Design an enzyme around this catalytic site. Sequence first.
Site, short mmCIF file in Angstrom:
data_model
loop_
_atom_site.label_atom_id
_atom_site.label_comp_id
_atom_site.label_asym_id
_atom_site.label_seq_id
_atom_site.Cartn_x
_atom_site.Cartn_y
_atom_site.Cartn_z
N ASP A 1 58.34 64.90 18.05
CA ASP A 1 57.34 65.33 17.05
C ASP A 1 57.47 66.85 16.94
OD1 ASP A 1 54.73 66.64 16.52
OD2 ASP A 1 54.23 64.54 15.87
N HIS B 1 55.50 69.23 16.53
CA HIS B 1 54.37 69.96 17.15
C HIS B 1 54.46 69.78 18.67
CE1 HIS B 1 53.01 69.16 12.95
NE2 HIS B 1 52.74 70.47 13.02
N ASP C 1 57.50 64.17 11.84
CA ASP C 1 57.16 65.37 11.04
C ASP C 1 58.29 66.40 11.06
OD1 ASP C 1 56.31 65.71 13.77
OD2 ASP C 1 54.20 65.88 13.08
N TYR D 1 54.18 62.70 8.05
CA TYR D 1 53.21 62.60 6.94
C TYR D 1 53.89 62.34 5.61
CZ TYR D 1 50.84 64.38 10.99
OH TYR D 1 50.32 64.48 12.24
N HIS E 1 48.28 65.55 21.37
CA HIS E 1 47.47 66.78 21.39
C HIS E 1 46.19 66.57 22.20
CE1 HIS E 1 50.08 68.90 18.73
NE2 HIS E 1 49.79 68.17 17.67
O1 V05 Z 1 49.35 65.75 14.66
C1 V05 Z 1 49.86 66.58 13.88
N1 V05 Z 1 51.09 66.47 13.41
O2 V05 Z 1 51.88 65.40 13.82
C2 V05 Z 1 49.11 67.78 13.38
C3 V05 Z 1 47.80 68.04 13.75
C4 V05 Z 1 47.17 69.14 13.24
F1 V05 Z 1 45.89 69.37 13.62
C5 V05 Z 1 47.77 70.02 12.37
C6 V05 Z 1 47.05 71.24 11.83
N2 V05 Z 1 46.19 70.90 10.70
N3 V05 Z 1 44.87 70.79 10.78
N4 V05 Z 1 44.44 70.43 9.59
C7 V05 Z 1 45.54 70.33 8.81
C8 V05 Z 1 45.46 69.94 7.41
N5 V05 Z 1 44.33 69.34 6.99
C9 V05 Z 1 44.25 68.98 5.70
C10 V05 Z 1 45.28 69.20 4.82
C11 V05 Z 1 46.41 69.82 5.33
N6 V05 Z 1 46.51 70.19 6.63
N7 V05 Z 1 46.65 70.59 9.49
C12 V05 Z 1 49.07 69.73 12.01
F2 V05 Z 1 49.72 70.57 11.18
C13 V05 Z 1 49.74 68.64 12.48
K K Z 2 57.35 67.98 20.46
ZN ZN Z 3 53.23 66.63 14.90
#
Ligand code: V05
Ligand code: K
Ligand code: ZN
Length: 357
Positions: free
Chosen positions: A171, A173, A264, A304, A133
Amino acid sequence: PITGLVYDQRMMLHHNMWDSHHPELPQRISRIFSRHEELRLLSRCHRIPARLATEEELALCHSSKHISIIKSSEHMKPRDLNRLGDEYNSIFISNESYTCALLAAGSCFNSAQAILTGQVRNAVAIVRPPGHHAEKDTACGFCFFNTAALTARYAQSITRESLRVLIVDWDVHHGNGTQHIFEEDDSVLYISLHRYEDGAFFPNSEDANYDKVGLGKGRGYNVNIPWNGGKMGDPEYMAAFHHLVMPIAREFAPELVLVSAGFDAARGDPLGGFQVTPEGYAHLTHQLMSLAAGRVLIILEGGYNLTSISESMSMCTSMLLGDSPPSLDHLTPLKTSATVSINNVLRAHAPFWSSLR
Ligand SMILES: O=C(NO)c1cc(F)c(Cn2nnc(-c3ncccn3)n2)c(F)c1
Ligand SMILES: [K+]
Ligand SMILES: [Zn+2]
Ligand SMILES: [K+]
């Protein structure tokens, strides 16, 4: 005939001092490593040491401003860290973050060097924080620097500027940063499979749609596979790999494959909503081993659910070590909307790839 593995516990030091249960946990990498030891995959690998990336190496993809602002976080007090994090979309920063981000990038460089010197055939990198990202000028979605984008440039810098690198991003996302860094580039083909839901799913932009095929000389070399209408698993990923990823990769003929390997999309992930099984991840890995004479680097991005990412990544290392692919018991036809997604991508990339006609 050797698989490289890089893991360093110092990358656990990056944490969220305000919310100790944030899903991007330090124990993501410690749990993956522990599971490689339990399945006796560790002792079968060649241990590639970690190193810090340099600032010259970070300037392969990122601007002076961005590198300097993150470097400055080392010396910041919590109040300033909080303030810094909030200037980006979904970043938390600690004292140790910049050093963890450097270590994740340098580990992948050492991995990429081991592959391109012939010290190993293929490699896995168990690193955090993730990268896909991060863009040239900002941090985003838990990512500081774009590890996979920097590894692609590092490869070219120790071989030749036009070294053909394929980045496969499974991934869940969209790799907004990967896409942007290479959008004008024919030397680096980017292919992302991602939940899209017409922009409702993070990171919430139309840049992740199938009609974003790249710009200028990089027209054709940006392939987005966006999913809509909820849950997807092994059948839809197998199908996209059969009709899109593998035909396009073969006609590109990469000299190195990089996987932005978020887990994920796993069954169990609370952020993805998908059901890609560990055996699903093994098949995806094994097909990519057919490319670039087996020169594959698998780089940890998101994921996660600690059990799911531990099982799924360990399963990918097993394929890299040459183990037989598991039985899927593939007995499912495609969700209606996954077929609609795949024909959309095939209509938009047929002008560029003869093998989709
Ligand atoms: O790298 C990522 N995935 O591989 C990824 C990055 C992101 F920024 C997001 C979006 N998001 N921002 N905050 C949160 C969050 N914070 C605290 C508790 C629950 N959720 N989720 C994502 F859903 C995924
Ligand atoms: K992807
Ligand atoms: Zn992701
Ligand atoms: K590209």
